[PDB]
Design a protein around this ligand. Structure first.
Ligand SMILES: [Zn+2]
Ligand SMILES: [Zn+2]
Lengths: 49, 51, 104, 117
C-alpha cells in the first residue's frame, strides 16, 4: 500500500513508474525469460489455496 | 430448459439462422478449443501459458 | 537526536561536506555555463516534513520534492569516522537504509 | 549388452580403431597416425539398441528441484531422505516411445534424489 499511496499523490509530487521499477516492485520480463516465470493473474484469488 | 418464447429457439427451429450448438455455447458452455485438430499445444516449454 | 537523516543527492545537487566558510570557498567555475555555476552556489539544508508525510529540499528559492525510499539492499551502518582515535573513530549515529532522491 | 564408447590413443590422443591379430588370434586397438598397439579387454566392438529403451531417470538432474514452474506434492515423501516435498514431471524426452510416466526430484538441497514410481 505504500507504493499505491505514493503513486496516488503523483502530479502533486514526482513519484512515477520509474520509482516502481527502481524500488524492485515491478520487472520487465520478456518472452524468452517468460518461459521460466510462474505467473499469477489476480492476487485476490490466485495466491490463496 | 428454454421457454417456448425463447428467441434463440424460434430462430433455430425455423432454420433461419443458428444451430443448437450456438445455443449451447451461448447459454451452457463454449467447449474445447482446437488448433490443427488437437488441444492447445505446448507453445512454451511443456506448458500452454506462463500461468 | 538519534534518527535516520540519510539523503542521497544526484551529481548536479552535490552539497558541500562542510559548512560554507569564506576561507574554504573560491571562484573557479563560470545554457552551457548555466548548469556549471549551480554546483557550488545553490549547493545549509533543511529537510521539511509536510503533513502528507513526504519531504522536500530547501536550498534557496526553489523547492525539490523528495521521496525517502526505504531500500533494503544497502544496509550500511553510517557513522562519523573522523580521525582522532586509533583509525577513524566512527561514532554510531544511525545506519543508512533509506535513500531520499531529490529532483527538479 | 553394454554400450561401447570411444577409446583414445595415449601417444597422440587420437581415436583408436580395433584390429584382429591374425597371428596370436587376439583383438588389439590401433591408431592410423601412430604405430601404437594395445590390447582390448571387452571383445565387443559395436552395439545398437533398436528398440532403444533408455533410462530417463539417470538424465534427471537434482538442480530441477528449484524450478519455480514445476508442480509440487508432499503426497509422495522422498524415498531416500524422507523429505515430504517432491517436484514431479513427465519424461520431457523426445523420442520417448510411448509414455506418461512421472519422475520425482526431492526439494531438499544436497539430497538431490531423483526417483520413479
Ligand atoms: Zn595414435
Ligand atoms: Zn530427499
Amino acid at each position: 500500500k505504500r507504493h499505491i499511496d505514493q503513486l496516488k499523490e503523483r502530479e502533486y509530487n514526482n513519484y512515477s513508474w520509474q520509482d516502481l521499477v527502481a524500488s524492485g516492485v515491478v520487472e520487465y520480463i520478456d518472452t524468452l525469460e517468460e518461459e521460466t516465470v510462474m505467473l499469477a493473474m489476480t492476487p485476490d484469488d490466485l495466491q490463496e489455496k | 430448459s428454454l421457454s417456448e418464447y425463447n428467441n434463440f429457439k424460434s430462430m433455430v427451429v425455423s432454420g433461419a439462422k443458428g444451430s443448437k450448438i450456438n445455443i449451447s455455447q451461448v447459454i451452457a458452455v463454449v467447449g474445447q478449443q482446437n488448433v490443427e485438430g488437437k488441444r492447445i499445444p505446448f507453445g512454451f516449454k511443456h506448458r500452454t501459458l506462463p500461468h | 537526536g538519534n534518527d535516520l537523516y540519510f539523503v542521497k543527492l544526484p551529481n548536479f545537487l552535490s552539497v558541500e561536506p562542510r559548512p560554507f566558510d569564506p576561507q574554504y570557498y573560491e571562484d573557479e567555475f563560470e545554457e552551457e555555463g548555466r548548469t556549471r555555476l549551480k554546483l557550488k552556489v545553490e549547493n545549509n539544508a533543511r529537510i521539511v516534513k509536510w503533513s502528507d508525510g513526504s519531504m522536500s529540499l530547501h536550498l534557496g528559492n526553489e523547492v525539490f520534492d523528495v521521496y525517502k525510499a526505504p531500500l533494503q539492499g544497502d544496509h550500511n551502518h553510517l557513522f562519523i569516522r573522523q580521525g582522532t582515535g586509533l583509525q577513524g573513530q566512527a561514532v554510531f549515529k544511525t545506519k543508512l537504509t533509506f535513500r531520499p532522491h531529490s529532483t527538479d | 549388452p553394454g554400450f561401447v564408447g570411444i577409446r583414445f590413443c595415449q601417444e597422440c590422443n587420437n581415436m583408436l580403431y580395433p584390429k584382429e591379430d591374425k597371428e596370436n588370434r587376439i583383438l588389439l586397438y590401433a591408431c592410423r597416425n601412430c604405430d601404437y598397439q594395445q590390447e582390448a579387454d571387452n571383445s565387443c566392438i559395436y552395439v545398437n539398441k533398436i528398440t532403444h529403451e533408455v533410462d530417463e531417470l539417470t538424465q534427471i538432474i537434482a538442480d530441477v528441484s528449484q524450478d519455480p514452474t514445476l508442480p509440487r506434492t508432499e503426497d509422495h515423501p522422498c524415498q531416500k531422505c524422507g523429505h515430504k516435498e517432491a517436484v514431479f514431471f513427465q519424461s520431457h524426452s523426445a523420442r520417448a516411445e510411448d509414455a506418461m510416466r512421472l519422475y520425482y526430484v526431492c526439494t531438499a538441497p544436497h539430497c538431490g534424489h531423483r526417483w520413479t514410481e
